[PDB]
C-alpha cells in the first residue's frame with residue numbers, strides 16, 4: 001500500500017518506545033492510560049510483559065470505578081472516574097489483547113458507552129443545532145470502540161455523525177475509522193451506501209487540509225490521519241502524492257524529537273508499524289515485537305545550563321496578569337507555571353487527561369461549558385503541545401487566553 005510507512009529507522013522507533021516505558025510503572029488511577037497500551041500492542045515494540053500487569057490494572061480500575069453501587073454512601077462523588085471517551089479507549093485496549101468484552105460487568109460497560117452516545121445524539125438533537133457535550137472525536141471514538149467489539153449502535157446515533165461529516169483532521173480521521181469499521185463489519189446495512197459516501201468525504205477533507213510542509217493539519221494530526229488513510233479502498237494519484245508527502249514530512253520531524261507526548265507517541269507507533277485502530281476488528285496477538293529494555297542512563301552533564309528569560313501573560317479575563325521568569329532552558333511551560341505560582345501571585349489548576357495535565361483554571365477562573373484555556377506563543381500563534389510538553393524558547397511570551405469555542 002502507498003499510504004503505509006514502509007521505511008523507518010529501527011533506532012528512531014526504539015527511542016519513541018523508550019519514552020513510553022516509564023509509564024508502564026505508573027499504575028495509579030490518574031496515570032493509567034488505555035491509549036498507551038493500544039499504541040504498544042499495535043506497535044513493533046514490547047514493553048516487557050509489564051504489559052499484562054498494565055491491562056490487568058486497567059481492567060480492575062475501570063471496573064471498580066464505573067460499576068459503583070446504586071448511590072455511594074454520603075458524598076455523590078468520592079473519586080473521579082474514567083470519562084466515557086476513556087471507556088471507549090479501554091474497549092480498544094481489550095481488543096489489543098484479542099479480547100471481546102463480555103460477562104455482566106462487560107455488558108454494563110457497553111451499556112454505559114451506549115447511553116453516552118445516546119445522550120450526545122440528544123445534545124446534538126433534532127436537526128443539528130446543538131453540540132455534543134464532549135466532541136465528535138469522542139463520538140466517533142465511541143462508535144469505533146463498539147464496532148471493534150461487534151456491538152451495534154442505533155442507526156439514529158450513527159446518523160448524527162454521518163450528517164456532521166456530510167454538511168479537525170483528528171476528528172475527520174476518527175470519524176473515518178468508525179465509518180471504515182462499520183462498513184467492514186456491516187453492522188448498519190440500512191445505510192451501507194451513505195457510510196461509503198461519507199468515507200469519500202472524509203478522505204477529501206483530510207487531503208484538502210494538507211499543509212505546504214506535508215502535514216495533514218499539523219504534525220500531530222498526521223499519525224491519526226495516516227491510520228485512516230492506509231485503509232485505502234480509493235487508491236488514487238492525488239491520494240498517493242499526498243501520502244508520500246505526508247510520510248516524508250513525518251519522518252523529517254522524527255529526527256527532531258518532535259514527539260514527546262505519551263499519547264502522541266501511542267498514536268504514532270501503530271502507523272510506524274503499518275497498523276491502525278481499525279486493525280482492532282481482528283488483531284494479530286501472535287506477531288512478535290522487539291522487547292524494549294530500560295534505558296537507565298540520562299547523560300550527567302555537571303554543567304551550568306543556559307537560562308531562558310520568558311514572559312508569561314494571561315488574557316481573556318479581568319484583570320490580565322503578566323509574569324517574568326528566568327528558568328533553565330528546556331523547562332516546560334508547566335514548570336514555569338508551577339514556578340510562577342510558587343514565587344508569585346500566579347495560580348492555576350490542571351486536571352488529568354490521557355494527554356497529561358490539561359489546564360482547566362487560571363488565577364481562579366475555571367473554564368466553563370464551551371470555554372477553554374488556550375495556550376499561545378505571542379503573537380497569536382496557538383501552541384501545538386500542552387503545558388507539560390511545551391518547552392519554551394528564549395525571549396518568548398507565552399499567553400494563557402480564555403477562549404470560547
Ligand code: B12
Nearest residue numbers: 085086170220221353354355359372374375382383384386
Ligand atoms: C477535542 C480536543 C480538544 C478540546 C478539548 C475539550 C473538549 N472539547 O472536550 C479543546 C478544543 C479544548 C482542546 C484544546 C487543546 N488541545 Co486538543 N484535542 C482535542 C482532540 C481532537 C480530541 C481529544 C479527545 O477527546 N480525546 C479523547 C479522550 C478519550 O481523551 P482525554 O484525554 O480524556 O481527552 C481530554 C484531553 O484530550 C483534553 N485535551 C484536549 N486537547 C489537549 C491537549 C493537551 C496537550 C492535553 C494535555 C489535553 C488536551 O481534552 C479532553 C477532555 O475533554 C485531540 C486529538 C487527538 N489526536 O488526540 C486534540 C489534541 C490532544 N489537542 C492538542 C492541543 C495542542 C491542544 C491545546 C494545547 C491547544 C492550545 N494551543 O491551547 C489545548 C489544550 C490547552 C489546555 N488548556 O491544556 C493536540 C496535542 C498535541 C500534543 N503534542 O500533545 C491534539 C493531538 C490535536 C493536535 N493534533 O494538535 N483540544
Ligand SMILES: O=S([O-])[O-]
Nearest residue numbers: 137168170383384
Ligand atoms: O483539538 S485541540 O488541538 O484543540
Ligand SMILES: [Cl-]
Nearest residue numbers: 108109111112
Ligand atoms: Cl451501569
Ligand SMILES: [Cl-]
Nearest residue numbers: 259260261389
Ligand atoms: Cl509531543
Ligand SMILES: [Cl-]
Nearest residue numbers: 348349361364
Ligand atoms: Cl486557579
